Write a protein that binds this ligand. Structure first.
Ligand SMILES: */C=C\C(=O)Nc1ccc2ncnc(Nc3ccccc3)c2c1
Length: 251
């Protein structure tokens, strides 16, 4: 087999609560008595896994250990997935300031991914974890509504198709987690997007933010901005772009 230094014995990990699981499971845990961990199990050819292993940033959930059945052990994110957090109870309270911040953190995790010349491929709220203090981190590196046309169609996945998903995740954030392209089914979305349709400005969301969404959704992957542009524009949002923002009923 020839394991690397990420490998531990199955006996080192103590599984406790179940937390969520179609293709496997997700548990809270304790690692050799001292350390709280999450544990992602798989249903019974890796690396692939060389991606979780080589990436290390503050806004990406940190791998701790892997096993061989196959287990993936990681830092524990206490608030679960962003999709659930947003449509749960602490969703009627989120306003644009908190939401753009959560958006700024994911852009930064993804800016790292970009400097490293990697691609995520399934960026969306279901794959962002939330911890204490509204910290967000990108997870689950390894459906078409989040996917850029050129990649749903021609397998052409790139950092720039990730940008596109980012823009879809922006509609998730600003709708408190609604499925995008509401009332449309996968085929209508593919057919309508190919023809130039784009989700309109979400209720109460500023135009300049919807405009960021539209940049993210350009037909030519190249004219989509970087995650580094995204990260910077989002962090500075309330001084440089909406200095006169005021809270409304929902945002
Ligand atoms: C959006 C669904 C989902 O994934 N929910 C979820 C709830 C609570 C969790 N706690 C801890 N970890 C995870 N997920 C996870 C995914 C990959 C690696 C580590 C943890 C979740 C997920």
């Amino acid at each position: 087999l020839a394991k690397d230094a990420w490998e531990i014995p199955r006996e080192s990990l103590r599984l406790e609560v179940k937390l969520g699981g179609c293709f496997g499971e997700v548990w809270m845990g304790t690692w050799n008595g001292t350390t709280r961990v999450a544990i992602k199990t798989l249903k019974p050819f890796l690396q692939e896994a060389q991606v979780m292993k080589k990436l290390r940033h503050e806004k990406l959930v940190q791998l701790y250990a892997v096993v061989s059945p196959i287990y993936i052990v990681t830092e524990y994110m206490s608030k679960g997935c962003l999709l659930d957090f947003l449509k749960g109870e602490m969703g009627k309270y989120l306003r644009l300031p908190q939401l753009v911040d959560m958006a700024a953190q994911i852009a930064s995790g993804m800016a790292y991914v970009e400097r490293m010349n990697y691609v995520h491929r399934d960026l969306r709220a279901a794959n962002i974890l939330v911890g204490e203090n509204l910290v967000c981190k990108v997870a689950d590196f390894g459906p078409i509504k989040w996917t850029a046309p050129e990649a749903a169609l021609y397998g052409r996945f790139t950092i720039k198709s990730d940008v596109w998903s980012f823009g879809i995740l922006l509609t998730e954030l600003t709708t408190k987690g609604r499925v995008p392209y509401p009332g449309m089914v996968n085929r209508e979305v593919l057919d309508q997007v190919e023809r130039g349709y784009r989700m309109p400005c979400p209720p109460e969301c500023p135009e300049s933010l919807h405009d960021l969404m539209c940049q993210c959704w350009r037909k030519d992957p190249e004219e989509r901005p970087t995650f580094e542009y995204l990260q910077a524009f989002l962090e500075d949002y309330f001084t440089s772009t909406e200095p006169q923002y005021q809270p409304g009923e929902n945002l």
